[PDB]
Amino acid sequence: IRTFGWVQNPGKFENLKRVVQVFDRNSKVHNEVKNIKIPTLVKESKIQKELVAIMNQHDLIYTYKELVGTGTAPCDAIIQATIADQGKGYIDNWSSDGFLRWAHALGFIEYINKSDSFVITDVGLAYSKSADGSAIEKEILIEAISSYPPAIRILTLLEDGQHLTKFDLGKNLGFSGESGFTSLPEGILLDTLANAMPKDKGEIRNNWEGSSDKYARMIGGWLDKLGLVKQGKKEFIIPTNKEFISHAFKITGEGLKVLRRAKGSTKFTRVPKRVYWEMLATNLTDKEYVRTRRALILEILIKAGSLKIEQIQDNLKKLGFDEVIETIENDIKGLINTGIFIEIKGRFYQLKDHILQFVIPNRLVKSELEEKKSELRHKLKYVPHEYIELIEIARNSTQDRILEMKVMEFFMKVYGYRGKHLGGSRKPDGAIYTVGSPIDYGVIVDTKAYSGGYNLPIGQADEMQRYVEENQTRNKHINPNEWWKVYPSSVTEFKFLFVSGHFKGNYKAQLTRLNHITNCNGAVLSVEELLIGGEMIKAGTLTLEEVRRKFNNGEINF
């Protein structure tokens, strides 16, 4: 199982070409690589004789392995050897993969499922022989990218002349909210930037980003170099101050022409867009099942006219995929969010685009986590479905940050709390409070993504005791950042909360101890109860004064 259609890390277009010119038997690089680079940088004789040989065939076809190899490292493959490092004389198996994913995404090479192999295409050879810097090579490049949905999607989001950051773009890019397509609330990120030390501002301004923010910056950078978009820093007035984001873009004249024609408002047909099963889901545990489900919905829309979600669900069921209307609706917003045009008029959907033939490989049991996503999408009628994605995100350690921001955002936007997300090693992940309640109270929050079920290690319970007491003592020498100022002075009653995928073990004993030392009440909250409690605030069957009483030094269950 592979994953394509999305690249996260930077590379030179001059290196992309070389990667392509290797599948073309009559190019210089092909010979240069197989006749010089490989026998030189590839020591282990056996693989060395196997690779040049493979590059020696008449009709060239390379398997994933032959191109990417393995890493830890020595030269293990073709791509590795045709591209030198940014200093070895070759690149690793990670950067090799980005380049493979990149060549494939723009359509210069095609993937043959089941054979786990690639070959050059029609436009790839033309790209290969194209003169460097010529007007024709540029032409080939712009046509290639126009068959790439995400690029078309980035262009659609800037069509009105808007000036947006990678975050404002990322939130409406791909299958938004789920793992692999996450975006950091801009407003929340600028806050961390405004109160940061000038020595860390740069890293936060450019390396603090969600998956979709990554893709938006990359795709946006591709379009910039081709003249379809213009990258320029966006500025903001953030009072603790002034801040700016350099990864911002704005459409151009040549970009609107490309979009106009891609929409179908021109005298020429649009460029047929390439879509593959491997692009309909990335870092999702159940990506094999989900990829198929979204693939089959695309198909139905394709061979059909105007349809009602119930008919789509109906057509889907015939294929053996028992889905609920809102899962199908979320799957469609993602298709739209990746570059495909599907008009929605009232209760009817109708695809209006030109997509080519893609193969659904091996044509699968729904996992317990997806069934839970399905249950909550068809149950929580007020909760923006995107939040239900936190149930899976909360089980991945690598996702603390987005978990951080997204949980605080839900508190303020859905529950109705005031306050904000803090984060860092000296501040709690968030500090929220109420206004106008019978008893206005404050809350100290800490979140944590963990796989399996948090038992609340004494280490994290240790870090929370520090926040609760610092809000009691409030000494500027102990903590010069006086974070507690976030709270209104009138507030005197505080609570502490730990939020995670789900809890198990003797977490209660930790709560009993912290309550005894600080005298404050606290609790633990599973992400699913966070959502359940937020849909109640909205349904009207739960109040912020009822939450107050939930802190009983145990687990909260609404």
From Swiss-Prot:
E.C. numbers: 3.1.21.4
Molecular function (Gene Ontology), one example: DNA binding
Entries under Pfam families matching the protein: FokI_cleav_dom, FokI_D1, FokI_D3, FokI_dom_2
Main EC class the enzyme belongs to: hydrolase
GO biological processes: DNA restriction-modification system
Application in biotechnology: Adding the endonuclease domain C-terminal to different DNA recognition domains from other enzymes allows generation of novel restriction enzymes that are used to genetically engineer eukaryotic cells.
Catalysed reactions, semicolon-separated: Endonucleolytic cleavage of DNA to give specific double-stranded fragments with terminal 5'-phosphates
Domain of life according to the entry: Bacteria
Cofactor(s) essential for the protein: Mg(2+)
Claim: RNA-binding is one of the keywords in the record: no
Residues annotated as the enzyme's active site: D429, D446, K448
Keywords: DNA-binding, Endonuclease, Hydrolase, Magnesium, Nuclease, Restriction system
CDD domains, per the entry: FokI_N, FokI_nuclease-like
Domain note: Has an N-terminal DNA recognition domain (approximately residues 1-292) joined to an endonuclease domain (residues 389-583) by a flexible linker.
Subunit structure: Monomer, in which form it can cleave DNA. Homodimer when bound to DNA.
UniProt protein name: Type II restriction enzyme FokI
Organism ancestry: Bacteria, Bacillati, Bacillota, Bacilli, Bacillales
Gene behind the chain: fokIR
